[PDB]
Amino acid sequence: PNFSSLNLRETNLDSLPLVDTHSKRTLLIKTVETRDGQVINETSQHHDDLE
Amino acid sequence: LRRQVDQLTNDKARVEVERDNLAEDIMRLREKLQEEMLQREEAENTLQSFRQ
């Protein structure tokens, strides 16, 4: 009876790294470059950071 | 004829200023519009990199 080899596993306690809370920090730097008031560029830098 | 040329000379000078009004706003526009074609070629190349 050397059981705990089963042990009906241990498909595990699963503190695994499957996280996004770990938050998905959507730093949306919407750089609206206007000239005179007209939009010339919108450099929308989505830094899509997973903390 | 001389009243019509004293008039055409004062007209030439007035109407050169009344075109200098339009063509100075088009000249400011043209210089800003060379700057805008760089802003819209920045939009083409930036948003076409983002299309890729």
Swiss-Prot record, chain B:
Compartment annotation: Cytoplasm; Cytoplasm, Cytoskeleton; Nucleus matrix; Cell membrane
Post-translational modification, as annotated: One of the most prominent phosphoproteins in various cells of mesenchymal origin. Phosphorylation is enhanced during cell division, at which time vimentin filaments are significantly reorganized. Phosphorylation by PKN1 inhibits the formation of filaments. Phosphorylated by STK33. Phosphorylated on tyrosine residues by SRMS.
Source domain of life: Eukaryota
Residues modified as N6-acetyllysine: 12, 32
Residues annotated with N6-succinyllysine modification: 32
Annotated consequence of substituting residue 52 to R: In CTRCT30; uncertain significance
Tissues where the protein occurs: Highly expressed in fibroblasts, some expression in T- and B-lymphocytes, and little or no expression in Burkitt's lymphoma cell lines. Expressed in many hormone-independent mammary carcinoma cell lines.
Induction section of the entry: Up-regulated by muramyl-dipeptide and lipopolysaccharide.
Domain notes: The central alpha-helical coiled-coil IF rod domain mediates elementary homodimerization. The [IL]-x-C-x-x-[DE] motif is a proposed target motif for cysteine S-nitrosylation mediated by the iNOS-S100A8/A9 transnitrosylase complex.
Protein role: Vimentins are class-III intermediate filaments found in various non-epithelial cells, especially mesenchymal cells. Vimentin is attached to the nucleus, endoplasmic reticulum, and mitochondria, either laterally or terminally. Plays a role in cell directional movement, orientation, cell sheet organization and Golgi complex polarization at the cell migration front. Protects SCRIB from proteasomal degradation and facilitates its localization to intermediate filaments in a cell contact-mediated manner. Involved with LARP6 in the stabilization of type I collagen mRNAs for CO1A1 and CO1A2.
Membership in a protein family: Belongs to the intermediate filament family.
Subunit structure, as described in the record: Homomer assembled from elementary dimers. Identified in complexes that contain VIM, EZR, AHNAK, BFSP1, BFSP2, ANK2, PLEC, PRX and spectrin. Interacts with BCAS3. Interacts with LGSN. Interacts with SYNM. Interacts (via rod region) with PLEC (via CH 1 domain). Interacts with PLEC isoform 1C. Interacts with STK33. Interacts with LARP6. Interacts with RAB8B. Interacts with TOR1A; the interaction associates TOR1A with the cytoskeleton. Interacts with TOR1AIP1. Interacts with DIAPH1. Interacts with EPPK1; interaction is dependent of higher-order structure of intermediate filament. (Microbial infection) Interacts with HCV core protein.
Record's disease association: Cataract 30, multiple types: An opacification of the crystalline lens of the eye that frequently results in visual impairment or blindness. Opacities vary in morphology, are often confined to a portion of the lens, and may be static or progressive. In general, the more posteriorly located and dense an opacity, the greater the impact on visual function.
Name of the protein this chain belongs to: Vimentin
Source organism of this protein record: Homo sapiens
Part of the whole protein covered: 157 to 208 of 466
